[PDB]
Each structure stands twice: as C-alpha cells, then as structure tokens.
Design a protein around this ligand. Structure first.
Ligand SMILES: CC1=C(/C=C/C(C)=C/C=C/C(C)=C/C(=O)O)C(C)(C)CCC1
Lengths: 244, 10
C-alpha cells in the first residue's frame, strides 16, 4: 500500500528535519568556517584525556539528537521497548556518523567540530588517527553520492531500524519496517540521481559504518585502561552507558 | 540502561 509507504516516509523526513543537531539552514551559514591555525594548535596541545572528553561530549550531544529522531518515528515507537533500546544502543553512533556527512566538506576533508570545520589533524591528540581516517574516508565517500536531505533522512533511519542487530526479540517487525523504508528511499532516489545503483551502493556501505563504530568502541576500551577515572567520572553518563 | 530509558520516555 503506497499510502502507508508515503506516510512512513514523510514522518521520517519530518523527524529528521526536526532532530538534527544542525539544520540545513545553520549549516549553510556555517559553510565557510574553518578553525584558525591557533585554534588547531590549541586542539593539538590538549592532553589526550582533555580531547577525548571533548569528543565524548560532542558525540553524546549528537547521540541525544538521534534519540529524539527515533522517538518521532511512528514505526520505531511501535516496536517493543526492549528492541527500541537495542536499536538505539547498537545504532546511535552509526546514525551520528551518517549525519556527520551533512557537516563534512569533501573538498578540503574537514568536518564541523565545536562550531567550525577542521581537518583530521584537529584530532591529533587522540592518538587514534586510524579511527579518524576511517571516519573521514567514509564521510568523503558518502558525500560523493550527493544525497539530498530526504535521502539522508530515510537512509539514516534504515541504518537505525536494522533487523540484524543481535539480541532483538522481534526482528521480523524491524525487518518489515526497514523494508518499507528502503522501498520509500528507492523511489525518492529516482527524483535525483538519474542512473543509479545508488540504493545498492548505500546499502553496501552499512558494514563500513559499523566497522568505524566498532573501532571507536575499541579505541575507547584502551583509553579506559589508561585513564579509568576520567571515563567513570568525567565522560557524559550516557556515553559511559552506551559504550561501557 | 537507566539513562537511555529515561530519554526515551522524556
Ligand atoms: C569526536 C569524533 C568524531 C566526530 C564526530 C562528529 C563531527 C559528529 C557530528 C555529528 C553531527 C553534525 C550531527 C547532527 O547534525 O545531527 C569522528 C567520528 C570524526 C572521529 C573520532 C572522534
């Protein structure tokens, strides 16, 4: 029933419009804003703990918006609460990564961080260039597809509503909603990207999105070894809860 | 997941 597909699509697009940390309008105005050399130096001078704490806050900030995104999606809130929790815990960062592509400049490889765009050298103090490089390469590759806001909305929702997450009690229900989302997205893609493979190319990036996020979890686990106190007493409570 | 649980119901 196209009627249902359309309503589901509109609801997700509406939710996305109302729940990104940065609206398209704000992004357009923040377009030409890269950190100054002094600001970049400042970032590189921060301790590893200090920068990690800053990164943890920014990520948590973005994750909180993904939670709002999910709550405004009718089909999501119809899933039993247990699965809602599982989808969010396993997919919040993946959605943030997809959304991050909206705030990534593929010409000079810079990402919006704390109000301005900065290259990967901005994260030097993390001592995790492999993680950063992987995050940037994905963003750069997703940006090459030139997705519209509607496509990003629908795709980010498909990433979130994944019937493959382990421990789901009612996977089939998640699968059913995700199929309606993918079918909606496939049609939207026709409006833009003439000559595609686009949906298939997007779907093929799913495992990559997950690899970047697992790498994040790994880098974090080691950080917890070196600085346990900073994690349990300084990082945002939600960040600790989701990745510990 | 006390926190995530709280946010979902806020
Ligand atoms: C801290 C940090 C990173 C940046 C995350 C960003 C920049 C998220 C942006 C989210 C947005 C911009 C959300 C929204 O609009 O909803 C990446 C993964 C590069 C590397 C490791 C540490």
């Amino acid at each position: 029933t196209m009627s249902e597909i359309d309503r589901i699509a509109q609801n997700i697009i509406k939710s996305h419009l109302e729940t990104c940390q940065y609206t398209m309008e704000e992004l357009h105005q923040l377009a030409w804003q890269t950190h100054t050399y002094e600001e970049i130096k400042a970032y590189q001078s921060k301790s590893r703990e200090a920068l990690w704490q800053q990164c943890a806050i920014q990520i948590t900030h973005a994750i909180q918006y993904v939670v709002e995104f999910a709550k405004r999606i009718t089909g999501f809130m119809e899933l039993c609460q247990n699965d809602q929790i599982l989808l969010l815990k396993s997919g919040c960062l993946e959605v943030v990564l997809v959304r991050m592509c909206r705030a990534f400049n593929p010409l000079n490889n810079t990402v919006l961080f704390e109000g301005k765009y900065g290259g990967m050298q901005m994260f030097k103090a993390l001592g995790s260039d492999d993680l950063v490089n992987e995050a940037f390469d994905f963003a750069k590759n997703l940006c090459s597809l030139q997705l519209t806001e509607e496509e990003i909305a629908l795709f980010s929702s498909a990433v979130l509503i994944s019937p493959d997450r382990a421990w789901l009690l009612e996977p089939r229900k998640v699968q059913k909603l995700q199929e309606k989302i993918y079918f909606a997205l496939q049609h939207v893609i026709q409006k833009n990207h003439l000559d595609d493979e686009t949906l298939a190319k997007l779907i093929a990036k799913i495992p990559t999105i997950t690899a970047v996020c697992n790498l994040h979890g790994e880098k974090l686990q080691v950080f917890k070894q070196s600085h346990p106190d900073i994690v349990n007493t300084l990082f945002p409570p939600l960040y600790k809860e989701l990745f510990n | 997941h006390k926190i995530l649980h709280r946010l979902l119901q806020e």
